[PDB]
Design an enzyme around this catalytic site. Structure first.
Site, PDB file in Angstrom:
ATOM      1  N   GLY A  38       0.714  -1.263  -0.109  1.00  0.00           N
ATOM      2  CA  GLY A  38       0.011  -0.162   0.006  1.00  0.00           C
ATOM      3  C   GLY A  38       0.979   1.217  -0.016  1.00  0.00           C
ATOM      4  N   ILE A  96      -5.031   3.374   4.985  1.00  0.00           N
ATOM      5  CA  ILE A  96      -6.216   3.921   5.767  1.00  0.00           C
ATOM      6  C   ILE A  96      -6.879   2.887   6.558  1.00  0.00           C
ATOM      7  CG2 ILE A  96      -8.274   5.131   5.624  1.00  0.00           C
ATOM      8  CD1 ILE A  96      -5.772   6.729   4.629  1.00  0.00           C
ATOM      9  N   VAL A 138      -2.547   7.773   0.477  1.00  0.00           N
ATOM     10  CA  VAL A 138      -3.856   7.626   0.810  1.00  0.00           C
ATOM     11  C   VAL A 138      -4.494   6.569   0.209  1.00  0.00           C
ATOM     12  CG1 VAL A 138      -3.983  10.197   1.167  1.00  0.00           C
ATOM     13  CG2 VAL A 138      -4.626   9.451  -1.016  1.00  0.00           C
ATOM     14  N   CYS A 139      -3.777   5.580  -0.014  1.00  0.00           N
ATOM     15  CA  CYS A 139      -4.405   4.319  -0.538  1.00  0.00           C
ATOM     16  C   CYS A 139      -5.263   3.585   0.532  1.00  0.00           C
ATOM     17  CB  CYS A 139      -3.461   3.396  -1.124  1.00  0.00           C
ATOM     18  SG  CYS A 139      -2.345   2.483  -0.067  1.00  0.00           S
ATOM     19  N   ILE A 140      -6.035   2.418   0.047  1.00  0.00           N
ATOM     20  CA  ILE A 140      -7.109   1.726   0.760  1.00  0.00           C
ATOM     21  C   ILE A 140      -6.280   1.218   2.129  1.00  0.00           C
ATOM     22  CG2 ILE A 140      -8.441  -0.330   1.129  1.00  0.00           C
ATOM     23  CD1 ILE A 140      -9.215   2.664  -0.299  1.00  0.00           C
TER      24      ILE A 140
END
EC number: 1.7.1.7
Lengths: 295, 295, 295, 295
Positions: free
Chosen positions: C168, C177, C172-174
């Site tokens: 990741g 987060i 601001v990727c999944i």
């Protein structure tokens, strides 16, 4: 090792009061006691004669500006006749030497005189301190503006009873942008640095963005905190007010100066509560941290 | 050495599960086991009686607010008669001393009592802990809010069974802005600091912006994580919903609380997968880094 | 000691070429030489069969996605019959064991197989490496994704011929987060860390925002750089194009993939010029600095 | 230990002048004295023949661009016949060798020649320095652009009379983005680093955003400061002007170049005032701080 207001958090200590109302926010400067350790900027965009009368009538410190210097002798006379403190500003030019001599001759002594110069670490300021102390020995003299411990020392040694600390303190003010010099962007650390050298009271001047910055200024060693923006744009302030859909003053509208000062006092009582004390000086011995992201 | 949630990345370890579904996200607090190590903020804008019943019926931890304090004795009685946990909030005023005595007399003992005060490191909180433990010895007592290891220690020593950690944790909350005090802008490091001192469970309260911040709170030593914003603005939440062109609640609309809790559980199983374990405690021994730009 | 792409500047060395055109940007991976050390993300939103044919026909590396896994045996057969490299993706489930056995039986050996799993440091990946190397010994095996030196080591030791690094990686990727884990926000330092441990080639996967980040990945030890966003939104890319007043693809429109690859090559020749060399490896021994404000 | 302009504040020293007007902002470069230590970028978007004539007529330094190279021999001849300095740019290609020989044969010697190449640490630049010094020994030779102390040294040693420092200095310029190399984002620290090695004058090239950055460049060791953006978009500048509701040039409109230069001089006098001196070199021995948040 440099930082500013936004980088600091004060650390709470055991609460010993049952109510904020128990906390005393007063401070003394020379021979007088005042409600709060804050003072409006001595500029015509922030203070005027009506605001100064309100302040003195309610035991808040003020320093009048010198934009209409011809009015200062009458201002002093009139305040003092109403039993109110007279606190004025002076410069360092030859006519200010005369002004002071004038005062000495009518035996007017203002309780407070502020020598107000952008770059106040100078022989111009040193000689004005010495002149004032000769002709008006009972006047409490605040000298500035300075940004270093050597300057505070030199001014204290010349006879100042306090110094005012801050050299273009705002993050995007003129001085910072145009000259590359001053305390802009590190005003709190500059205050700490200057305060460690000082034998006399310091007025911390500018960079205040929140009421919490008043407590922070006290921690790092202010006695009075001079505030511009937070006092700008009240109904009472200079300028004009603009349903409708919410007022503006000259940028928004903050309502009544009196409500702002009450809230400042309440917020400061909360600060004392969190500091584990009952009076202002309790803020001076709290621990603190320097946070990573502050913006 | 201070940081917050956004500055931390946890480092993956060898994956030992074939599916997220293998990972156990449960936690125990006192005598009860719950589905997840999260709990909604004990405020009337976030939780109510319908939401509390849903939560207890499905083995999620809750703590009811005390906005309508006159309803708490009936609330306890009713939950417990449906075989559900009763978890309530109390203050420290003289009438709360009576309230507790009242409970003792009808022999109602709530499974959980949270003493909920802004500045919880105080003798007011210490005496309420001692009062509760005298009249309702079987009640599990959570005391706060605190922000230092000395406070956690003092409260644990007074008899608290857990402490709640966080003093104005949000980056732009009231406490931070108005007083200059608290954990705002360094909540994760504050949690770590407090946790290293603690002999009893800690509830980490606030500053949570993402589901990944739950795993981060667990790493640095939380047992339960108290969440406001992420639970705000569900159909079930207090307030009113606003085609059209997409709903708002009071700021946007997050749909069903049940779907949010399922996703929280799935995300947390992924965290355990990445931690190289099969249960929640595996998150506690991963390595981490502090990143340079986090905003 | 952690940083990312935006924090690094490479320091120029004496220029020894008279023209960019003198600089050689080629790289070898296993038995084949390619034009550039870059490769499109192996996802259906980025690559397809037409794009893969263009790439192989012009000596650019590609790795096909596995979204339509039933098509891979024909894809291999067809590429190889046109004298083109076959580079495919596989997973680690039981049916992928069969797939591989299938290949072994028609004596199809793809030049390149990429085992593509989110959390690739696992026994699932280790056993698939060992299975592939038993049934298709001539296939060049790239295994990932990993984020630590211990993982690179374990995968290399299991038999991988290269590893793919990045967990990741986007800011601001999944993954970042939702789980709190991975290389997001420190992808470059993660690459360096993993590379120092590696005996085999590394494919640096993600966090690339500019063509200058390709040189930076090479400095800190990549052999191939896998790119998503910079290759997204070309006329040739999956999706639909949207006078008018300037196109969009699915977010803006970058024109022709061929022009992008030419510019990448030119920019990379400039990098070699600044590195004081004539070939790609010259980038590997330049000095660098870590800048203060990078955003 | 790397920083840029926005991170630095200079610290005031005791003021010794009664007026800004007392401060001398002049600098010498080779055999000539100029009003200010600033110079417009030698590009056709910034300077032209009319602007160069204004500048030389008023004792400001300029360096003409080489976009219309066929005009340089006449330009030199004409300036020098009006008793004005001729300051031109050259490249390093074979035709520039001829150009120089041409000059030597008409016994035209420009006072200043700037060798202007993106990556100026090269044997191409070294040989052009040596060629110029053979055929036009009286010409003052400025060589660049460079970004390291080894480069400054090598160029000074080849015979340059000054060096120009900056390699894609802007925070979002092409060089930085496309190659990953240069001084972008740390131009001030790069200047300091290069200056510590230098035996000859340095022209600091780019990254200037405010007039205060001129003083900052002087502190960390510039003799002349080359400026692009601040001089772009004057009425006199190349391009076209766009009531109405306020002009634009090609991005806004700054009015008259003459007013900009006057303000630059005034701002620089203020800098000298704050530095505790009366002349430019006083800026060189002030203390400074590196601030925490600078954006």
């Amino acid at each position: 090792n440099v930082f500013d207001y936004e980088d600091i958090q004060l650390i709470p200590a055991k609460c010993i009061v049952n109510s904020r109302s128990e906390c005393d926010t007063t401070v003394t400067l020379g021979k007088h006691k005042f409600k709060l350790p804050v003072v409006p900027a001595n500029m015509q965009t922030i203070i005027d004669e009506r605001i100064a009368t309100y302040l003195a009538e309610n035991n808040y410190f003020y320093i009048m500006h010198r934009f209409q210097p011809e009015k200062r002798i009458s201002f002093i006379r009139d305040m003092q006749s109403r039993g109110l403190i007279a606190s004025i500003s002076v410069g360092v030019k030859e006519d200010e030497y005369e002004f002071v001599q004038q005062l000495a001759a009518e035996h007017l002594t203002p309780e407070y005189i502020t020598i107000d110069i952008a770059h106040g670490h100078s022989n111009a300021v040193i000689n004005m301190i010495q002149h004032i102390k000769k002709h008006l020995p009972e006047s409490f003299v605040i000298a500035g503006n300075v940004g270093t411990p050597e300057a505070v020392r030199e001014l204290e040694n010349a006879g100042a009873d306090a110094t005012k600390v801050g050299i273009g303190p705002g993050k995007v003010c003129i001085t910072k942008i145009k000259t590359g010099f001053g305390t802009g962007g590190w005003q709190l650390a500059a205050l700490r640095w200057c305060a460690k050298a000082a034998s006399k009271p310091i007025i911390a001047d500018g960079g205040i963005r929140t009421n919490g910055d008043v407590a922070k200024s006290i921690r790092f060693g202010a006695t009075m905190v001079m505030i511009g923006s937070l006092f700008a744009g009240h109904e009472e302030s200079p300028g004009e007010t603009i349903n409708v859909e919410g007022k503006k003053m000259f940028v928004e509208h903050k309502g009544s100066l009196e409500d702002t000062l009450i809230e400042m006092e309440q917020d400061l009582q909360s600060s004392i509560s969190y500091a584990g004390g009952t009076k202002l000086d309790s803020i001076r011995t709290v621990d603190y941290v320097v946070v990573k992201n502050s913006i």
